[model samples]
Target: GDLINTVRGPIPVSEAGFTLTHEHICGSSAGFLRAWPEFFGSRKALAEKAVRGLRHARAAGVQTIVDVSTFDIGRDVRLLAEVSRAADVHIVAATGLWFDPPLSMRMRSVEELTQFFLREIQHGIEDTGIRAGIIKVATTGKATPFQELVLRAAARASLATGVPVTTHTSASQRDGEQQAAIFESEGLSPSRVCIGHSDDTDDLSYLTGLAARGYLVGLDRMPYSAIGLEGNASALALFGTRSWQTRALLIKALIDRGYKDRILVSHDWLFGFSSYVTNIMDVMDRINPDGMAFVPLRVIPFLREKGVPPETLAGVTVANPARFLSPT
Candidate 1:
């Protein structure tokens, strides 16, 4: 049987169990975690909130969470390991980059960037002995020149490490297809890449095309419907304003179309941010009563009510993620 890496360590895929494939908790590095007191409050505040949320999700049978917070996004493997131990739930940390790299990141070549990610995956992140379990890269409306470099590096790292690649794509642009083409040019196996945030659009054809190419489709970003007071209200809208029922229907359609094994769902919920779009946690809680637990607590029951079989639903909630992370 294949093994999956978690913040707690490697475990057989069987133990991966019911999983949320894309999410973020304590969404910052250890440095800013305390420094940004206005954003995250005290150190204990961060821990208390993360552990509490994980425990709630655990109560609903979420055995694992893959935090696709790439290095630039404040991955903090050390924090993840601590939370995993405290919450008694598995966490899979990421080693890659998101959109708009800073000057420091742009200084490195693609091979150099690949080595950077490889070090964290193969050795351990920041000498914490907590190796990252996945490679996460992202693109906005389109892949910028620099984003292409990062994407290529991510592809190389995924191939080199035999780990999986997850992505953040602008669903409206159907950007995942462009990403898949790039990964294909790099000779990446489609099965090893998940076109994340597929739920942000209702474009059935775009999703079916990805599934047909053997790429796992991530229906993450499950936490909200209401836009709140924030600087980037447009950012909130970028995730789409579809209701839970709409996404549930999308999942059912995929299952009915014989792509159940290619589907994964998660909230892409963040415990808190380092900065930017601060103070929306309460707003989110009000709009999304279930928080990170939405998929399991709400969507799963909806699928069950729609006559989705237990075994089949488990295949999407559990097996799909395991297969996506398992060595190809």
Candidate 2:
């Protein structure tokens, strides 16, 4: 059986080790609205740096990464495929749509939008050769009809391809809850799905419930916490340090509560910008400024300092994630 994790799919036996649940091989928020005038530019200077970062992960023993960058956010499979080929690490990228209003609004109707997403999954719309390892969806938080249609479409695509689903939800976590319930009602196994940015909410009870329902919870805020709670912030703290201790404590709580295998963590780091409003704010707020302190590099070392057991570290890094990646 092939397992599907947040970071990989049907991973080969040889690759069945520590994996970075989330990491960007190469992504730009440049054109996307949030990262414009000040976002990292797509220059040789920048690409070179991003490539080195990928190499850094490989050197650190990270075998796989889930690149969730969707449309309008540098979902350039050509670049990704090149990176995958260059790095020993397997880079799993996403497709479907980002929450960019123009793209989202332009493709509104359920059938119209579903077919558009289907084309990419079934036929490779733009020669990406990516075959979309997972389906990406977004919700507007206020629970609009358009957002529902997008969620349903993404859920359908997951069923159609037997691929898993991942989503970008509102900062409040309302949208994520809606998406999760919708997917469950559609008969999709919630364990096979990942709700992106779920760490944005301050309420641990809220996340605990989602994990209890078999959905994977994302904690991809490691490499940067300056943005606060867009999903992954410990408001209760000491001396304002970027406390992984707090994060690990919360994760341990969830795991101890029986959702251990469903947890995933990542940086959601971007190298540059794209054409969406969120991109504007995302690019500048990166946690690790360049190579100074990237995750999978500094994080593993830190986890070691925190006394996280090697096997438990393997669970967060590899084994636990294998539950999602394994295709039954």
State how far residue 284 of model 1 sits from its true place (Å). Answer: 1.0
Per-residue lDDT of model 2, residues 1-328, tens digit only: 4644322223563364665555554445424323442344544445465567667766777667767776645566666665566555577666666665465455578778778777766666376444556677777575567767777787777777776777777646456677877887777889778887665555677787788887888876664443354443332120123454455455556656767677886666655544334344343444445331355566666666766666776787687556655542
Using TM-score as the measure, the top candidate is 1
lDDT of 2 at 304: 63
Candidate 2, superposed: residue stretches over 4 Å from native:
1-16, 25-43, 101-105, 227-245, 274-293, 304-307, 326-328
Worst 10 residues of 1 by lDDT: 226-235
